[PDB]
Amino acid sequence: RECISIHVGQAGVQIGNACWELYCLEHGIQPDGQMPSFNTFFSETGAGKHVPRAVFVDLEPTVIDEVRTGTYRQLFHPEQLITGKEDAANNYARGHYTIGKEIIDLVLDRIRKLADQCTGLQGFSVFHSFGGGTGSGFTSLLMERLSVDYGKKSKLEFSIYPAPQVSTAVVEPYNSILTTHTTLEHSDCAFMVDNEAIYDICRRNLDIERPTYTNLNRLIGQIVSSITASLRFDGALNVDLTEFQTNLVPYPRGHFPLATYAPVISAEKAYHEQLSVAEITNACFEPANQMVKCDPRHGKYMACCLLYRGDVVPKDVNAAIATIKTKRTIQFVDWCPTGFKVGINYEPPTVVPGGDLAKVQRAVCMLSNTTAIAEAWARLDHKFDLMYAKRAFVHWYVGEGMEEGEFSEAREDMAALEKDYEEVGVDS
Amino acid sequence: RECISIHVGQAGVQIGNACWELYCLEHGIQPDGQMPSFNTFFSETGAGKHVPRAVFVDLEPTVIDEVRTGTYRQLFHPEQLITGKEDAANNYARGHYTIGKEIIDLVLDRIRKLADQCTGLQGFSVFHSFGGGTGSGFTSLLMERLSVDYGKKSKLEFSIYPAPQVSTAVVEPYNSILTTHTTLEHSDCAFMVDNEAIYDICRRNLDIERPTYTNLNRLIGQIVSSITASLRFDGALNVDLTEFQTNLVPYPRGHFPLATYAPVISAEKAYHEQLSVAEITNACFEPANQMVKCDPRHGKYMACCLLYRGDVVPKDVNAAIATIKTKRTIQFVDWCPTGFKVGINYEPPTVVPGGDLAKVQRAVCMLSNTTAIAEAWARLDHKFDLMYAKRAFVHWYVGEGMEEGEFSEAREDMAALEKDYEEVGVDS
Amino acid sequence: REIVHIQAGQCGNQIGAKFWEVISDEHGIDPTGSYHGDSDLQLERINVYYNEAAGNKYVPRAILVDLEPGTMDSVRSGPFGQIFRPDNFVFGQSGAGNNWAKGHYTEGAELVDSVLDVVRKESESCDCLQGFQLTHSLGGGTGSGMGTLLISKIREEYPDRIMNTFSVVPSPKVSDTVVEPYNATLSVHQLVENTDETYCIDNEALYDICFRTLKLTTPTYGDLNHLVSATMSGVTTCLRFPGQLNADLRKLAVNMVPFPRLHFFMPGFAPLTSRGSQQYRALTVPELTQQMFDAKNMMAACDPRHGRYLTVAAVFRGRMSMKEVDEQMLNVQNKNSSYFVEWIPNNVKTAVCDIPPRGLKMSATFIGNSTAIQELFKRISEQFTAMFRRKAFLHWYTGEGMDEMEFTEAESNMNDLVSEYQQYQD
Amino acid sequence: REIVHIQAGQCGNQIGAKFWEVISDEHGIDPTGSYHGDSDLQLERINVYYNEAAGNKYVPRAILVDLEPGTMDSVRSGPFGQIFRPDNFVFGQSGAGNNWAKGHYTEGAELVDSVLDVVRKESESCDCLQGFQLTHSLGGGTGSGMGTLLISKIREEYPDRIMNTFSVVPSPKVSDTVVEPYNATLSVHQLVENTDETYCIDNEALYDICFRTLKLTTPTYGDLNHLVSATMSGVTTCLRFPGQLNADLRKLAVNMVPFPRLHFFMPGFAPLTSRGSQQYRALTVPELTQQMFDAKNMMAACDPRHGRYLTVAAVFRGRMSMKEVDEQMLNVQNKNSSYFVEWIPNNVKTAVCDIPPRGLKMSATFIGNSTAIQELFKRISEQFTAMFRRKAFLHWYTGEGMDEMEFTEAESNMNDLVSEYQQYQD
């Protein structure tokens, strides 16, 4: 019943920092590993120290060093903290090939070591970003190997969705297009969120006009914990990760369920307001709490999964579902009946001490696969096209051995993906 | 069994401030919402805090800020307090169209949220003023949407009737004429009062020669509470809001019942004087307590509703009615028999601590639809005409997209309304 | 929600010196820049006129403009010249010399580009502008000349913001520049159609008030500009602070302008009497209304009872009853019905603020738009014609390229305003 | 992970004198060589620029090169000249005299072998080089002449390391050498294709900034080179210290170069204003972005709004929100969309470091690659042509064997960069 977390790149690792901090908060784990009390994620020592079963990869020493100098440096095993010396430079060509390919063997052997520590490997999940060099480059490299060795294990990916308006990486389209090509075909499911959309959540629901990544990742951590800690904890409907895959992936392509999370409420907003299960789920179908800037009303739904924490009575859930099925404007694709996975954990929602979110007594996470995602690809299509037509920055990949045909090909694979969304949109 | 109050504009909000203060006084509600003890208006939290189901709209931050900094800032939910940045400028053209139309969607969604919080929405009522920019402009905009979504719910409006002698808004005729056009057709019933008439009440019955709006709105609040708090409380004849509509609106046009309220008595005037139910109702048919400067003796009655608080015995009421039917000079229109709605609540009348009105043991509110209202329209007709003939101030509307034909049209609609009053006056 | 103010010309710069002083008084802001008040309201709406700079420093949202460093320096040298940032001092070198052509048409025109750039920087610093205000003289070179140029460009950039200005109108007796009516004529030609509203201040009238009711025998321009700032500050504070009525500048503009072209105002102020009598005065609403209606308490050398009143605004500061205000305004309307225009029913409008001016219990600002205003235009137009025929000093102006036909059109336009006042005088 | 810096020419040597001073300031390293700081970070990433020698001595990883001992001596004589080891002073005897031919082609060429040997010794001392940086003047003999020669050999030895250089670009008004455009032309011919990137510093622009915004009336080159070092140090510290964004020099290079040949940069810097106004400034992200975008705060005598922006890098130092930075950069992109090139979506990229420069709360470095840069090339090329036809001082150069056809090709190559900027200016 075990799983492995993999943190690649800054985004992967810094999100991971929040994630493991939250898992410590879930059980009262001390920075040194001492836990007085979740062995699905952790491995126990004779001292009662538990080791989070995870791998941290950075090709630049700095971020891992940040871990190594922080409080959780005692928690993590030195072998889990893997670092190279040089970067990918925002570039798949080095991340996947030239540079990252050198260290990956080590990385894999640490993974395999942990796989041998697992007794019942259920699977794993990889945290990264769609635009970066290691964030997406190295990441796909890893998938190429992991899908061989662990072909039957859960291969869930979580990635930051490139913001349409702000991006620090000029060749991000190129990176992301190459990842599509290689991740679609290897991964089982990839989830993503938009930091821009999140900012809007922070300013509207948390009332914060100063979000940093350390805020943004707390919110992400919430979502992740709902599906990682609480799915291993007790509930009414205990849903596994393999079950998630078995209930969220409808086609052999990928699919890309997007996250939505409600409650996201400031402490003051929690006052004077009573949420019910149904009210929270109402919020879950509002564009306003959509974690990716993509309009839910534009597309049609294919999948939807609702996962519940704390004070949730199935009775209320059932009523809530009835209304979301019938009251809303949620259009859905023919193919699908509304079999929405309901996970119901008794495990209460948790809050980070010193965080922004209010203590809540119940909480709902929503995953959804909508046809509007093709528009996200359309965004990438043109951004890629523009660059590629001019061949701007192309020498930074070509010099590492990339082929122009390959890039065209990858775009075409994306186009095919868009076409399949088109297909799904056609009802039948 | 629930309802929504809507406060638009200063007039709407400041009156609302008095109204919600009175509801707090009705049950002992603390500024923070803590009530130790009326859930038709309020929504309960697990802390025992209750939230008044109401929406506050101001396009200028200031008045809402006044709420936000006062004691009742703890009572109101931050989402109920909606504010824009700029004003309508006394002008329908911006209030209904250019400016207010931008924020209204938010406003509506907060309303809808509350509508979803309601389990049995009976209806709602809107507080505003016939002359202002948001007071009447925005207001009608709202009705345009609310009448779609809540077509079968009570749509009662309360508005300040423009004083014939004092008005601070030079284009008030124009504003009010445009509202006629758009409110007549959408609303169910609109009530109104004249601050000038009220001043006369304050100086003659309360003996106060220094009324401010904060006095004036207390008196309005009294009237409103009689029909809002006490109609949900217990009585002999428990009358609902829908019942009010069903008992006050005779035609599909609008109608405009005017308020009259007796007792309005200073503490010293209460001494040495014993009011009975009958005596109070005698006062109710006196011009002297008429809340609008319009002569009751001029027109003919069409509707009349009497609502009773405290120590009222139907026995006495019956006798009182007999005398008002036969003793008075009240002429009434043929169409109507004297079926005057009698609401009889055991719920006693309440008084604002530090207010002007004397503690009374019984009280009567009167609503009435008289043909004299056409004279009020005549006032507007000429005021509008004068301005419109010269085309004074017309550029302040035209520049926002208003049409001159439209203005003519709106006047004509008023003329038609006057003609229908003429019609009713003709007995048949 | 915010306002930007630009001062120009020696007049405008010295008026603004008092204006800003008062605004900081209103909010408890020290001459050095920090806030040392003591009321919540004092900081609460400070945004309209101040930017809070790091360190709890408040920067007045205004630009000081001139073409001679020395005037600017003298402003800077006093208290509150330190509160202005150096970046708000935009000036050239060599005067204008009270020459419209230099100011507007040629040389001053050159500076305007740098002024406007700073204006833009401030427009960005604001969250949401309500409008702009400018202070200047109608017969001056930079005051009107350069100032007008600036206005035409600001209006262009922000059609949707309030553009108003207060300006010193050449008094019948004291003109300084021989062609002061010429400059004024040209400014009408440019300003009237490039502004939402303009206020008419006559120094002569001001000197009469200061001795007539205030019984003072030593005023300077700083004392008279105090009175000016009282009216200016009166207007905007209400907008800033909590009141009862309707406290928005744009709404004021809407209520005071019946016609696109006739937007000239006669400011007045109450209470405004000497200390001796202060022991014999009573403070009531009728008391303020008596002072407000009385033409001698007007700051414009006009006579409202000679003309007809189109619009009247009565702004009140401090706690007053609504009833009393309503009744007294009605009474005014009633008793002075012979001066009001019949086309506008209830031509007297009110605005009420609950915050009194520091040191007083109550106060009121009179704003009027009468037809009487046309008399000032008539005086100028006439004087202009005489000069026009002789070309007095027009070689200076034509030497800088100003064409006489432009002036001819300016003359017409003055006459047009008069005819339109006649058209609504009836 | 480490960087080697080489300074050359009187300019380069004096700039480096300030650069290294600052780096040691950043890390608390004393003028004598030992570490006396007080922050963990100060030693933590010291490796990029210092070798710790026995005794807790830090050796700056740089070579000081000249052909006159006296300049070297003057450098050595001040604080921080003692921190450099004697082995890093490589120099000859007899000038160059600001002669490319001597520097590159003949005499200075002789010294380069000894320089390179030391370079090799240091390349071995590093664990892993990230790259190299050189400081020099484009129109100087050793600065550009000898320096260029060195660069071509270093690049040859390390194709895989970053090769960049910062160089003083002949200002339109102050050229010292009559053939300064000639030397510059030759350096373009050699450098552009033998470097990954070069920065364009104009002293004239720097002198304007120091008086324009900093309001200073006494600067020297040490004060202006302070500003230069602010930008240089700004870049590498982030790479050194913990941040939020992506703090790698190579990644910067990748994001800023869309085309193999167009790698010229316009540095700028914020905040950068006089103390007077510091009491009237607010420290926000938009504040920094206002200073960063403004062309007057550029250190290059160009005008980015004249040309088109290909790439923009915004580097931030200190605690800022991600949101605010993202939004303001977006706003910039939005409002200045007319200057950005349409081929690159979201052409403004950011980098964020959480360590502020000593003494400031926040700071930002502007790096741009516009087409406007071509104007500098055009000025030089033109001046060159005139001289070329006359052979001014070319007997000195041809006397040392420099052939005119090589110069002819150099001219073409300048023109080629301009045409390529035009090719992407569109």
Ligand SMILES: Nc1nc2c(ncn2[C@@H]2O[C@H](COP(=O)(O)OP(=O)(O)OP(=O)(O)O)[C@@H](O)[C@H]2O)c(=O)[nH]1
């Ligand atoms: N939510 C979130 N997004 C982040 C975080 N850090 C970076 N990102 C986003 O991820 C992308 C940045 O990737 P980089 O940090 O440049 O690169 P990397 O993927 O770590 O790998 P390299 O390019 O080789 O350094 C941008 O789109 C950022 O907005 C973080 O802590 N949280």
Ligand SMILES: Nc1nc2c(ncn2[C@@H]2O[C@H](COP(=O)(O)OP(=O)(O)OP(=O)(O)O)[C@@H](O)[C@H]2O)c(=O)[nH]1
């Ligand atoms: N009874 C009562 N009447 C009020 C009150 N406030 C204002 N009024 C009246 O309502 C009208 C004023 O409307 P305004 O305050 O100008 O405007 P508004 O309707 O709030 O909206 P805007 O014009 O956009 O500011 C006048 O006829 C006033 O006499 C109040 O508190 N009580």
Ligand SMILES: Nc1nc2c(ncn2[C@@H]2O[C@H](COP(=O)(O)OP(=O)(O)O)[C@@H](O)[C@H]2O)c(=O)[nH]1
């Ligand atoms: N109220 C008032 N008027 C002033 C002041 N200064 C100059 N004036 C008037 O302005 C006119 C002269 O214009 P001036 O301001 O010198 O023009 P400029 O300086 O060239 O723009 C005369 O009518 C003066 O009475 C002042 O400080 N207050």
Ligand SMILES: Nc1nc2c(ncn2[C@@H]2O[C@H](COP(=O)(O)OP(=O)(O)O)[C@@H](O)[C@H]2O)c(=O)[nH]1
């Ligand atoms: N910023 C700056 N420029 C300098 C310095 N020294 C010389 N320069 C510039 O460099 C050019 C002269 O080249 P120089 O450095 O004497 O050449 P070299 O010494 O023979 O290599 C002129 O354009 C000067 O403005 C300096 O310390 N700082």
Ligand SMILES: [Mg+2]
């Ligand atoms: Mg990284």
Ligand SMILES: [Mg+2]
């Ligand atoms: Mg209002």
